[PDB]
Short mmCIF file of C-alpha atoms in Angstrom, two decimals:
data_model
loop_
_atom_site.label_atom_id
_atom_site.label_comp_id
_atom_site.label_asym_id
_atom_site.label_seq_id
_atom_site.Cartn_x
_atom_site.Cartn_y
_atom_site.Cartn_z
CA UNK A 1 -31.70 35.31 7.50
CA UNK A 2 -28.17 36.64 8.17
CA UNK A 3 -28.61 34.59 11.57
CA UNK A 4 -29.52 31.67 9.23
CA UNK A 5 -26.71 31.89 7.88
CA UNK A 6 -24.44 31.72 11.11
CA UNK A 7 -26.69 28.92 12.17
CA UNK A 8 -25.86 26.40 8.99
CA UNK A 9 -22.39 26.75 10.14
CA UNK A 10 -23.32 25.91 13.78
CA UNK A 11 -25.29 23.31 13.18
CA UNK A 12 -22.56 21.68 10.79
CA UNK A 13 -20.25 22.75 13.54
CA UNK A 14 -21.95 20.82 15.86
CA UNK A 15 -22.15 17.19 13.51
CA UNK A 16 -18.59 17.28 13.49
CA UNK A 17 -18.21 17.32 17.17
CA UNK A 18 -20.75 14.38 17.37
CA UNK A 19 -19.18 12.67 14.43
CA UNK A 20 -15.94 13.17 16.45
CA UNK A 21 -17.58 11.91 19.41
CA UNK A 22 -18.19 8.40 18.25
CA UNK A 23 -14.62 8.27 17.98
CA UNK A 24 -13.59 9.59 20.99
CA UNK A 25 -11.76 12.39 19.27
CA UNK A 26 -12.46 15.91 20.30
CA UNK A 27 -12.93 18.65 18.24
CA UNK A 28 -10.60 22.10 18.28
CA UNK A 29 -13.36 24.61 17.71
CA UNK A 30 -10.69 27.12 17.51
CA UNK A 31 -9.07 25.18 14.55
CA UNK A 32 -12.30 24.68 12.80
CA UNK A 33 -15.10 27.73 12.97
CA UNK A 34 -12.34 30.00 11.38
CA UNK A 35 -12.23 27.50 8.35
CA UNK A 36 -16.11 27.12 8.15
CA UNK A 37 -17.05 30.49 8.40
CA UNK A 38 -14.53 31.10 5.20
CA UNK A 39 -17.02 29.02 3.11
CA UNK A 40 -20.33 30.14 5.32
CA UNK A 41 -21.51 31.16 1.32
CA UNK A 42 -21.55 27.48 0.39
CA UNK A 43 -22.51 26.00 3.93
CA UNK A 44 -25.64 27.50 3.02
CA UNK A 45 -23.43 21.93 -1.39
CA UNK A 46 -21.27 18.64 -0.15
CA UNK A 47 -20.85 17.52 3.60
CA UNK A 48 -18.36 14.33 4.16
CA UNK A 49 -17.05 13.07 8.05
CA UNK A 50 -14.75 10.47 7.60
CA UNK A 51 -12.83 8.54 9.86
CA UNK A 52 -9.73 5.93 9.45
CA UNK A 53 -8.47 2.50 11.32
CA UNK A 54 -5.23 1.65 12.93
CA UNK A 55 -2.76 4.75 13.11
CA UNK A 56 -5.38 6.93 12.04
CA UNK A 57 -7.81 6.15 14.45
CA UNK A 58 -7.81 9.56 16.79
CA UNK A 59 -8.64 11.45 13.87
CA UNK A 60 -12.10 12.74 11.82
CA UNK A 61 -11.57 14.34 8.56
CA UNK A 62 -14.45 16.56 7.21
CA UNK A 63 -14.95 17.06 3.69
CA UNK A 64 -16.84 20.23 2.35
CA UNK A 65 -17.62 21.30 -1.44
CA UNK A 66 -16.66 25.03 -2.61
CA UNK A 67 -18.35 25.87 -5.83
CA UNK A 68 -15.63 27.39 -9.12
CA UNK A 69 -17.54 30.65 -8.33
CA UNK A 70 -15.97 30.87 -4.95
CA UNK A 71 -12.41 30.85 -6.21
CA UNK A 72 -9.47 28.96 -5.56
CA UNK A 73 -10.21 27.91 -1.93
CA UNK A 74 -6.22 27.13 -1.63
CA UNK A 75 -5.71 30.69 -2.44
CA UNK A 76 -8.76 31.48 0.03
CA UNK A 77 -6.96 29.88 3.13
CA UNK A 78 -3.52 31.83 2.41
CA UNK A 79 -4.54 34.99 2.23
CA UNK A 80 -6.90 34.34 5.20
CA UNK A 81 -4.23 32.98 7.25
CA UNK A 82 -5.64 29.64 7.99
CA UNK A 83 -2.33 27.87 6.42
CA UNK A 84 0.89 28.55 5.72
CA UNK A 85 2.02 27.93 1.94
CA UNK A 86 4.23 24.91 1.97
CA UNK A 87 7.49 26.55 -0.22
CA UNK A 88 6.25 23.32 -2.34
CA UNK A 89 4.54 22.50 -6.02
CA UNK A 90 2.06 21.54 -4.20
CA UNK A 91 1.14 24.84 -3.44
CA UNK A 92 0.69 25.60 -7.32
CA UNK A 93 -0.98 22.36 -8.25
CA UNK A 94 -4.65 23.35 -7.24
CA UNK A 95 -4.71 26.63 -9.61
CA UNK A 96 -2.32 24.68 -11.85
CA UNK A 97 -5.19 22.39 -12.60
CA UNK A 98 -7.85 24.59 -13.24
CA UNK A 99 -5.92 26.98 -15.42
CA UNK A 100 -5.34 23.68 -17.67
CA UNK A 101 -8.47 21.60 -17.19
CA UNK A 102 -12.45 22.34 -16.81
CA UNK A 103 -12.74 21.76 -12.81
CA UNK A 104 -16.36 21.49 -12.42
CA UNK A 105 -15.67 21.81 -8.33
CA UNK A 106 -13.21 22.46 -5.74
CA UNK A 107 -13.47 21.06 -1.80
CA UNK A 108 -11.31 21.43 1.36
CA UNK A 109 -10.63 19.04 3.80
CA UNK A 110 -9.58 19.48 7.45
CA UNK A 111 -8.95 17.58 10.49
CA UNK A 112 -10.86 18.55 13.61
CA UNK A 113 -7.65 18.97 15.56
CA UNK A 114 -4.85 20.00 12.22
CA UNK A 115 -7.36 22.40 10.69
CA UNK A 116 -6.82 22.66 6.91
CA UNK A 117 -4.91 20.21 4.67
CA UNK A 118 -6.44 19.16 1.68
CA UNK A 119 -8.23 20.48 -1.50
CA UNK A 120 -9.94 18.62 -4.49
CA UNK A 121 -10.70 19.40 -7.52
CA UNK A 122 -13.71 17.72 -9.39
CA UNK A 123 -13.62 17.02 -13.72
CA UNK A 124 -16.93 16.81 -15.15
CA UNK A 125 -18.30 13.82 -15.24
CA UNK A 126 -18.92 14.03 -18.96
CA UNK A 127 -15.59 15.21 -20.03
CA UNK A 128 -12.89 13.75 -17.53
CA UNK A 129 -9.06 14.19 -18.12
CA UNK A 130 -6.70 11.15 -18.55
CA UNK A 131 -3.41 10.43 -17.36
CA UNK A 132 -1.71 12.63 -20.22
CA UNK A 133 -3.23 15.44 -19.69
CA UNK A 134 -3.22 15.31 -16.33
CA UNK A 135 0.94 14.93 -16.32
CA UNK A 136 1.04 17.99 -18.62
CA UNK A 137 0.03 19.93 -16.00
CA UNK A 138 3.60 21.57 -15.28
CA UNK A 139 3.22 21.18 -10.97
CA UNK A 140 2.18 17.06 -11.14
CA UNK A 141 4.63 15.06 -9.62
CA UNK A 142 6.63 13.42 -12.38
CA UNK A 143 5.54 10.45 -11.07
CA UNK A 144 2.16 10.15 -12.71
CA UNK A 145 4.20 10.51 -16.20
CA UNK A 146 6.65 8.02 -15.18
CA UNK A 147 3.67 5.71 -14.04
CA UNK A 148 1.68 6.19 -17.19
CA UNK A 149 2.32 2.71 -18.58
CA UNK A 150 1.22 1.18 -15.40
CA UNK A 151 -2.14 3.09 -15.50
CA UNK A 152 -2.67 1.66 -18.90
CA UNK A 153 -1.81 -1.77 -18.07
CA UNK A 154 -4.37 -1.73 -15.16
CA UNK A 155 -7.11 0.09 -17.35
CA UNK A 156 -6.89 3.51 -15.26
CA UNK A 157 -7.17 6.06 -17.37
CA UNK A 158 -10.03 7.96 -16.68
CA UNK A 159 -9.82 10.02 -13.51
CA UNK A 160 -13.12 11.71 -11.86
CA UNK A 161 -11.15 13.99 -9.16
CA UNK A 162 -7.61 14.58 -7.65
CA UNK A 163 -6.69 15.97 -4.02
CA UNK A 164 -3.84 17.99 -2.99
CA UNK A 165 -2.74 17.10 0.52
CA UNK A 166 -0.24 19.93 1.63
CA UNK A 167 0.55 18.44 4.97
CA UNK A 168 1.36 15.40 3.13
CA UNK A 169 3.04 16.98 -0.15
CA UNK A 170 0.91 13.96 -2.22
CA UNK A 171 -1.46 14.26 -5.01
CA UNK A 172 -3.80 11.30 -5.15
CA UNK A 173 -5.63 10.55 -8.60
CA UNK A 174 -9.03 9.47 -8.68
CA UNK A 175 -9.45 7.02 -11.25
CA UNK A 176 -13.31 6.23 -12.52
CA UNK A 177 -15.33 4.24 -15.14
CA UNK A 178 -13.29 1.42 -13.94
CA UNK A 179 -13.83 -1.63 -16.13
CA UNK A 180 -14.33 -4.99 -13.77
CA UNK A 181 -10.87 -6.65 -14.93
CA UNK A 182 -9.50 -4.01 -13.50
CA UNK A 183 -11.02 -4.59 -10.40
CA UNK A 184 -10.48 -8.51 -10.42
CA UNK A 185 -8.50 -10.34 -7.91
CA UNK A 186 -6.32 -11.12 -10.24
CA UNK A 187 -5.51 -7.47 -11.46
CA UNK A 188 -6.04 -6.52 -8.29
CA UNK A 189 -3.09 -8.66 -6.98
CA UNK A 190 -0.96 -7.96 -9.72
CA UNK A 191 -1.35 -4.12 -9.03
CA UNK A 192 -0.33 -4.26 -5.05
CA UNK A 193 2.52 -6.76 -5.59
CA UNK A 194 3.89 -4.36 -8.78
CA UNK A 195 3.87 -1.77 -6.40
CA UNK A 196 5.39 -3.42 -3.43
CA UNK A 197 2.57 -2.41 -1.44
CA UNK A 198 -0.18 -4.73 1.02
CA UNK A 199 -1.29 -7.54 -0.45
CA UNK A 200 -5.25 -8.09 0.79
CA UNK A 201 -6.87 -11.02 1.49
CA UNK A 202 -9.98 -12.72 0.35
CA UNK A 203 -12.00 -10.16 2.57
CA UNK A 204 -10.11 -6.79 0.54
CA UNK A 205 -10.33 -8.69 -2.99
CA UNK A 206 -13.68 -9.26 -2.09
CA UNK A 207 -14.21 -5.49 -1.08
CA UNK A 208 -11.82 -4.57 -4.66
CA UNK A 209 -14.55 -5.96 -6.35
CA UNK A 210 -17.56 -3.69 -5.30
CA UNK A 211 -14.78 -0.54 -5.98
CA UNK A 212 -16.16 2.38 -7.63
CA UNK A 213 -12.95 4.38 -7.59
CA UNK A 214 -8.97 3.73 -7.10
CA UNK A 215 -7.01 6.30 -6.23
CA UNK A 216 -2.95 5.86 -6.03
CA UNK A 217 -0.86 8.38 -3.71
CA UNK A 218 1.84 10.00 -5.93
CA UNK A 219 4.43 12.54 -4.30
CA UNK A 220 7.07 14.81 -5.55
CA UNK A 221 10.30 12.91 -3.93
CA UNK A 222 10.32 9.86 -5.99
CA UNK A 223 8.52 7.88 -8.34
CA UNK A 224 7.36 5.23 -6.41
CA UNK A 225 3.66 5.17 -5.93
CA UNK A 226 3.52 5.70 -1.76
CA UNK A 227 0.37 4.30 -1.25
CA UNK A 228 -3.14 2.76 -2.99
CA UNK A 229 -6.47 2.91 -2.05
CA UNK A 230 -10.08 1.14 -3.91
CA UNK A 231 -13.39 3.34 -3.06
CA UNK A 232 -16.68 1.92 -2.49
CA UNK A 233 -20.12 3.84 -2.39
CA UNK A 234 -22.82 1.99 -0.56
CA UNK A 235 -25.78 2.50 2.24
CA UNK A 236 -24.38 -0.60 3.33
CA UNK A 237 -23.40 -0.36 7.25
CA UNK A 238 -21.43 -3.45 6.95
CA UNK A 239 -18.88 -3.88 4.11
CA UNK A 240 -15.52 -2.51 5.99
CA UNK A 241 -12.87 -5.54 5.25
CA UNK A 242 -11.32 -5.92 8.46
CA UNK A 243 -11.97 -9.80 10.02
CA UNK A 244 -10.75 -7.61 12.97
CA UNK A 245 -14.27 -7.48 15.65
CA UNK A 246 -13.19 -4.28 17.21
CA UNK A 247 -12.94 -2.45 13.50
CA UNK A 248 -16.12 -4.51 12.31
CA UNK A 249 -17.75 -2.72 15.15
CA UNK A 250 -15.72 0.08 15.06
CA UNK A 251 -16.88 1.15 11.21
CA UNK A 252 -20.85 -0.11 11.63
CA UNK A 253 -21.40 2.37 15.05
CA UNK A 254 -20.15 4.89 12.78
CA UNK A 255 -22.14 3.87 10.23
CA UNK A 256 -25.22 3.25 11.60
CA UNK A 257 -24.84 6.66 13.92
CA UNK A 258 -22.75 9.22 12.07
CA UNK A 259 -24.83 12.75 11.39
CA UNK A 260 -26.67 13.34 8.88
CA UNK A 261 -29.28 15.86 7.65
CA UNK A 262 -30.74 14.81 4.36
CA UNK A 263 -32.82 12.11 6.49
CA UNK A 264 -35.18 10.41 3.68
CA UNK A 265 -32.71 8.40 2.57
CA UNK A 266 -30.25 5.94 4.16
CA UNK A 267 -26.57 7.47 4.92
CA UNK A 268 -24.31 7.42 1.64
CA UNK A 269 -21.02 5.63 2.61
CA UNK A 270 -17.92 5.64 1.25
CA UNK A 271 -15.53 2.86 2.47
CA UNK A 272 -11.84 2.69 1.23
CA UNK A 273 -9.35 -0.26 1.62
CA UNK A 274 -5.70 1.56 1.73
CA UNK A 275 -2.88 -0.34 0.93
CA UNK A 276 0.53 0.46 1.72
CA UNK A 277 4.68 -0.81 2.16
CA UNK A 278 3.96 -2.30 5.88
CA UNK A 279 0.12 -2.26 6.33
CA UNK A 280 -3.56 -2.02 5.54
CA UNK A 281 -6.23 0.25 6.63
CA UNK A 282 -9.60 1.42 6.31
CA UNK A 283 -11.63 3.98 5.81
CA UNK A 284 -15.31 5.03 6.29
CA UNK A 285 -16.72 8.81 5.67
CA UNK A 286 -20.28 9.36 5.94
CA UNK A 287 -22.21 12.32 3.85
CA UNK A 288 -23.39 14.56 6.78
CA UNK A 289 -25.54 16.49 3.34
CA UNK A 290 -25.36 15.28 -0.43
CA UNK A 291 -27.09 16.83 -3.34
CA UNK A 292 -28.73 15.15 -6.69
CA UNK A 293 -25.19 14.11 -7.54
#
């Protein structure tokens, strides 16, 4: 009852440490209860363990959904003491976008040994900002104005979600009903090499393709996009784009093993290629719970 309550938070507890164990990452419990048992009201509803390649490998990121009802879950952590407020704009942006925008859902993100360091904030699917009036929100970087033409070259207008990472000081935008030029090699090409950043192979165009989201990495210093990234959804163990045998592995033992507790279906997977000045990575999270959505 009550004790059920305590025990959804153990028992998502208790994923993550597994999740971190096919990594061989260990978990801070310390770090991490204080920040579940915050949200214990909506533990009781989105569940996400994700893990990265290459620098970021000795890392898991977890991912959990805080219904509007809840509140600001930024605000939640500060008062609470689970962060300190960065002196940033970052700090407003969360709030910022809800006082201008219908957010149909927040979420908070943590790492198993940082704690806390990211929110989101979720448009409806049925009435999802653009880049305008997403840049007239008075705490965006000024970067997604001055990148506004660019969006509209590529077809990105429409964007599903953004996420506030105040570690980071970044705002990434989370652009959806992508139209398949877009995501052609072509475009796809054109985009990176615009931007200065990787430029992927037949293996990442490949992977471009099947993109259901691209999200760009926008910060506060400077206009210049830091970093880009295409989203896939798939039950598909296989489709990280690394011709690398130790990440191939790597991303389908996670895949094929992460935790999970809506078992009827086959584990939702969400792969990202990330594309930066020097490098590429890769990403994999895997829903631990997932509702109709």
């Amino acid at each position: 009852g009550p004790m059920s309550e305590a025990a959804d938070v153990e028992r998502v507890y208790a994923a993550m440490e597994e999740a971190a164990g096919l990594l061989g990452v260990a978990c801070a419990r310390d770090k991490i209860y204080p920040l579940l048992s915050t949200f214990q009201d909506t533990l009781v509803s989105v569940v996400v363990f994700s893990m990265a390649s290459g620098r970021h490998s000795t890392e898991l990121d977890f991912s959990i959904s805080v219904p509007t009802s809840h509140g600001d879950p930024y605000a939640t952590v500060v008062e609470k003491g689970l962060f300190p407020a960065t002196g940033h704009p970052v700090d407003d942006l969360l709030a910022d976008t809800q006082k201008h925008l219908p957010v149909s859902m927040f979420a908070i993100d943590g790492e198993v040994t940082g704690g806390f360091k990211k929110t989101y904030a979720f448009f409806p699917t049925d009435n999802m900002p653009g880049v305008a009036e997403l840049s007239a929100i008075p705490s965006m970087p000024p970067a997604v104005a001055e990148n506004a033409e660019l969006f509209a070259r590529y077809g990105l207008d429409k964007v599903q979600m953004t996420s506030m990472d105040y570690k980071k000081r970044q705002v990434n935008l989370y652009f959806s009903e992508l139209s398949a030029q877009t995501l052609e090699a072509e475009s796809v090409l054109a985009l990176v090499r615009e931007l200065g950043l990787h430029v992927p192979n037949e293996l990442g165009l490949k992977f471009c393709k099947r993109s259901f989201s691209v999200y760009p990495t926008l910060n506060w210093e400077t206009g210049k996009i830091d970093r880009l990234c295409f989203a896939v959804i798939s039950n598909d163990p296989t489709l990280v784009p690394s011709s690398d045998e130790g990440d191939i592995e790597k991303f389908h033992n996670y895949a094929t093993k992460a935790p999970y507790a809506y078992v009827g279906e086959k584990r939702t997977l969400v792969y990202g290629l990330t594309l930066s000045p020097k490098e590429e990575y890769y990403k994999l999270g895997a829903y631990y719970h997932i509702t109709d959505v």
